[PDB]
Amino acid sequence: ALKVRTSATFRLPKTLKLARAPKYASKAVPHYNRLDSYKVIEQPITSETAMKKVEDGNILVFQVSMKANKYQIKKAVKELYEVDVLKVNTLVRPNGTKKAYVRLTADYDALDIANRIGYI
Amino acid sequence: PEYVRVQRQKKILSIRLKVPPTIAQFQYTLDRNTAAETFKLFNKYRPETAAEKKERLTKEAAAVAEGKSKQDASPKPYAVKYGLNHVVALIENKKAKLVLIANDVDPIELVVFLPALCKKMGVPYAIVKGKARLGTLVNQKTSAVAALTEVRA
Amino acid sequence: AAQKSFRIKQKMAKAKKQNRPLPQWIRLRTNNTIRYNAKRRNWRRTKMNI
Amino acid sequence: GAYKYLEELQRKKQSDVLRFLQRVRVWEYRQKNVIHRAARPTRPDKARRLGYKAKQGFVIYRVRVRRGNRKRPVPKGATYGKPTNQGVNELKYQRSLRATAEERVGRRAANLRVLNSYWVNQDSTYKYFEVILVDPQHKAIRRDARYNWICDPVHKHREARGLTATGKKSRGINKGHKFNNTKAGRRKTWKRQNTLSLWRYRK
Amino acid sequence: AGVKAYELRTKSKEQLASQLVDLKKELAELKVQKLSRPSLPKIKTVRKSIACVLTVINEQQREAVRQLYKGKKYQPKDLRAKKTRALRRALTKFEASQVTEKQRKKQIAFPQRKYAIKA
RNA sequence: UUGACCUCAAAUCAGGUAGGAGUACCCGCUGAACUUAAGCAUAUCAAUAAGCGGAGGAAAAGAAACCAACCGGGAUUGCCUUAGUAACGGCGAGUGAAGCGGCAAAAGCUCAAAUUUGAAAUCUGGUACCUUCGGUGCCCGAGUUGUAAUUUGGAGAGGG
RNA sequence: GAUGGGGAAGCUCCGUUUCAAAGGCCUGAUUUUAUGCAGGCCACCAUCGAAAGGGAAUCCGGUUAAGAUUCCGGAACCUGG
Ligand SMILES: [Cl-]
Ligand SMILES: [Cl-]
Ligand SMILES: [Mg+2]
Ligand SMILES: [Mg+2]
Ligand SMILES: [Mg+2]
Ligand SMILES: [Mg+2]
Ligand SMILES: [Mg+2]
Ligand SMILES: [Mg+2]
Ligand SMILES: [Mg+2]
Ligand SMILES: [Mg+2]
Ligand SMILES: [Mg+2]
Ligand SMILES: [Mg+2]
Ligand SMILES: [Mg+2]
Ligand SMILES: [Mg+2]
Ligand SMILES: [Mg+2]
Ligand SMILES: [Mg+2]
Ligand SMILES: [Mg+2]
Numbered sequence: 001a002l003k004v005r006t007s008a009t010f011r012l013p014k015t016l017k018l019a020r021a022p023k024y025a026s027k028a029v030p031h032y033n034r035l036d037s038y039k040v041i042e043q044p045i046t047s048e049t050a051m052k053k054v055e056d057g058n059i060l061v062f063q064v065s066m067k068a069n070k071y072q073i074k075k076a077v078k079e080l081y082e083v084d085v086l087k088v089n090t091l092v093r094p095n096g097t098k099k100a101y102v103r104l105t106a107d108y109d110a111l112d113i114a115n116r117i118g119y120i
Numbered sequence: 121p122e123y124v125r126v127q128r129q130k131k132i133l134s135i136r137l138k139v140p141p142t143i144a145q146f147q148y149t150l151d152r153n154t155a156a157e158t159f160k161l162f163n164k165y166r167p168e169t170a171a172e173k174k175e176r177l178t179k180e181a182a183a184v185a186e187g188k189s190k191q192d193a194s195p196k197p198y199a200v201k202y203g204l205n206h207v208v209a210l211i212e213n214k215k216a217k218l219v220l221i222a223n224d225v226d227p228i229e230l231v232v233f234l235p236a237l238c239k240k241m242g243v244p245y246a247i248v249k250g251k252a253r254l255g256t257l258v259n260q261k262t263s264a265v266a267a268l269t270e271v272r273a
Numbered sequence: 274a275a276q277k278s279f280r281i282k283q284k285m286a287k288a289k290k291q292n293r294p295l296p297q298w299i300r301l302r303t304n305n306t307i308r309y310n311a312k313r314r315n316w317r318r319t320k321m322n323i
Numbered sequence: 324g325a326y327k328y329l330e331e332l333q334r335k336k337q338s339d340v341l342r343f344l345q346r347v348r349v350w351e352y353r354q355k356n357v358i359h360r361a362a363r364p365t366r367p368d369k370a371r372r373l374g375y376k377a378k379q380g381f382v383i384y385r386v387r388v389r390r391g392n393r394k395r396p397v398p399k400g401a402t403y404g405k406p407t408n409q410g411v412n413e414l415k416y417q418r419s420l421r422a423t424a425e426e427r428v429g430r431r432a433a434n435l436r437v438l439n440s441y442w443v444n445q446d447s448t449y450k451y452f453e454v455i456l457v458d459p460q461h462k463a464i465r466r467d468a469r470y471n472w473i474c475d476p477v478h479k480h481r482e483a484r485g486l487t488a489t490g491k492k493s494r495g496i497n498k499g500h501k502f503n504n505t506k507a508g509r510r511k512t513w514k515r516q517n518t519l520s521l522w523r524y525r526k
Numbered sequence: 527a528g529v530k531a532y533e534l535r536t537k538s539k540e541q542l543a544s545q546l547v548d549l550k551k552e553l554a555e556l557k558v559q560k561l562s563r564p565s566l567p568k569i570k571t572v573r574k575s576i577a578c579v580l581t582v583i584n585e586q587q588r589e590a591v592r593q594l595y596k597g598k599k600y601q602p603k604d605l606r607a608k609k610t611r612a613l614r615r616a617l618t619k620f621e622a623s624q625v626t627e628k629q630r631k632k633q634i635a636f637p638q639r640k641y642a643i644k645a
Numbered sequence: 646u647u648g649a650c651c652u653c654a655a656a657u658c659a660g661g662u663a664g665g666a667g668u669a670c671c672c673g674c675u676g677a678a679c680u681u682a683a684g685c686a687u688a689u690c691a692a693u694a695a696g697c698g699g700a701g702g703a704a705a706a707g708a709a710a711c712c713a714a715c716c717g718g719g720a721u722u723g724c725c726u727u728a729g730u731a732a733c734g735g736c737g738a739g740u741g742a743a744g745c746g747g748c749a750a751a752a753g754c755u756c757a758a759a760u761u762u763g764a765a766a767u768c769u770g771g772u773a774c775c776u777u778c779g780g781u782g783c784c785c786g787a788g789u790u791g792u793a794a795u796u797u798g799g800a801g802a803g804g805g
Numbered sequence: 806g807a808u809g810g811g812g813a814a815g816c817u818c819c820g821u822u823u824c825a826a827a828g829g830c831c832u833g834a835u836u837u838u839a840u841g842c843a844g845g846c847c848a849c850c851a852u853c854g855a856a857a858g859g860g861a862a863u864c865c866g867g868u869u870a871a872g873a874u875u876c877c878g879g880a881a882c883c884u885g886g
Contacts, residue, residue: 010121012826018658028591028602038550043557096286118558121826123653126354133347140339168764196763203789205324209760227365230790233328252650261650264790276856326758367790372757377791379769404677406686433663460662463769465617468624474617483699484672498711503743507706618778
């Protein structure tokens, strides 16, 4: 006989699909981490306005890579300086660089970390 | 789908229109009983396989090269002749004893003149059903023609 | 213009950093013929046509 | 073999057998796309004498082309010129419809090389052709001494420059007094005959 | 000052990565000092050392891959010869020298002879 | 029920390929008008400019369905000449080649159409190994709706 | 404004669900491993198009030479898990 077709519409049948098994690698050498901790954090900002936040607001001011987001900045600060971060605010400066306001938790002081780095 | 519909409508179109006798003669095919008897005889003359040809060459090489034979240490083969160019030449030389013609050749001009050629040369012919079936007895996917020239006693 | 795309602001940053006079030590180099900045731009004279 | 019979039978186009075959086939082609792949040649004898071989690397395509003249593509028929150039409707394209078929197949399969083409069918609206194509990247062609000439970069898009059989016919590339204008290129001949030659010691 | 490429090549990748981290720390420290001193030309030497270490690491990693694909007919495209696009599509020496059996027989039978018009 | 064949599909399937740029010179398509004719429509400018498609280091052409009327020459290209000539043209304005002769450079060739039929003798790819612009063994596949050898008109083929 | 298709020597033109075999989330089946394999569901079939249309959710006080419904202090709310 013939197959019973309750629908008058014919549709493309589902066929097996195989995954790729290349004979050679696409590049054969993976690229290293494009944004590691030393690239996310470029250098601290040491203007007079930024120094007041360090003393008063318990906030460290950094210049960061334009490609880094808030997740990467928080992770980099913890690994580079062994501190805890409460929150991160970022902005793009008129000269084309990114500035991050990093506020530490109450268990840490921004003043003693700042002079441990070397800037004041 | 489109390919299915064009496939069924071409079959319809070939019978709605008048068919000239040169093409219409292919609607008659050998019946089941006679065709079954025919293939039993043709199956006894299968061409040698590639694996079997390996044994003949290694035996022939060990026979004539070292034994100083005349390259005739093997019996004369008996096999079904196939190939459109080969078979047509055999018919023109009055060497074929029986010719099988497939009715399923889509470029029908390749085989359309064979019944007339066989009729004029006095070679009996049969329009058998299935070009794929003829291929099975020559170890091919499709043969479209087959013939016998020499048969054992 | 306060709400601006990133492309416009990035070009604004580049124009800001180029708006400076000629460095003085350039004039002291051997076989120097550059006397001043010939491509200086001011917002009151020529627009950027960005 | 059977190729000899095929050549002679193809010449009886208005016989009863071929009229039936050309009617059923012209319907089948019209139901398909304007350009589509052909599994095998419909005229195996004709393909062989044009250079086709039954081996991997040889491809056959079928294409239909609209018939008729070439209407001048001007808006509303206005030509903006002298009356000698005001014709619109009775103008003819300088290349044949067979050439147009090869060009469109060539663009469709740009990885292949056009070898030849032949007429198969026609109706009031379309003419049908089958184009022979050779793959220059296949190792069966690059290792074949009789066909690896096509792999040379100088043979890219032969149909575009009119280097095929139909292309040379439309260029007038023949010998004799009947082809003085186009023996070795019409434009090159015109340049030679319209060039002022001056030597260092004037003749 | 600065590292030497030939000295780095005699060291394993474990201690090449450690030296790279040490130079990265030194570069970051010098950036802080740059914000207080009028000039600091030592910053350039550390940067070139980082470039040199990365170069030696890349050379060793790529060379190991070449040994992994030695003799195989397919290799990654970045490890293949560059040349030009046209040169890579040309017929190989083996393909360009192919002749038919009919032509080979004629060449053996009647080659270009060597002769001179003397006497 | 099962296994083939034919045709048509799908996959981030295995390995490849095409596009864009440049464009002086080269191969095609398409295509004007200003201008000249003391006006002007055929003609001329011009089978040109602009527009579009396609190559290389050169391209194209090329081993005669040629030129000739001779005591014949003998693939193609270029130079000198033929020649502002034969011829075309409101026979107005204007336009306009070719054979021979001298020279530069010289080079020849192959497919289709035949039964290997006492043996598809042919080929891509995969895989192992090696002397790796490739080679050998093995295994699938392509192919008899024709892949090799043999013959291209100057010939040539089957027998003795 | 792509695709499927049909025009055009061609640069490109028509057309937007069109003469197309046009696609994926609820699970079940599996404890060789990750998703192959069973019912059924749904056929809607790219994408672009509003800083004044539609739309999940924050307020007060204080602070700078120049920022804040974004920072500080306090007090809330929404979405996903
Ligand atoms: Cl602004
Ligand atoms: Cl040919
Ligand atoms: Mg912000
Ligand atoms: Mg793939
Ligand atoms: Mg005038
Ligand atoms: Mg005048
Ligand atoms: Mg006038
Ligand atoms: Mg032009
Ligand atoms: Mg080039
Ligand atoms: Mg040269
Ligand atoms: Mg050439
Ligand atoms: Mg000849
Ligand atoms: Mg000559
Ligand atoms: Mg003229
Ligand atoms: Mg559109
Ligand atoms: Mg939108
Ligand atoms: Mg304000």
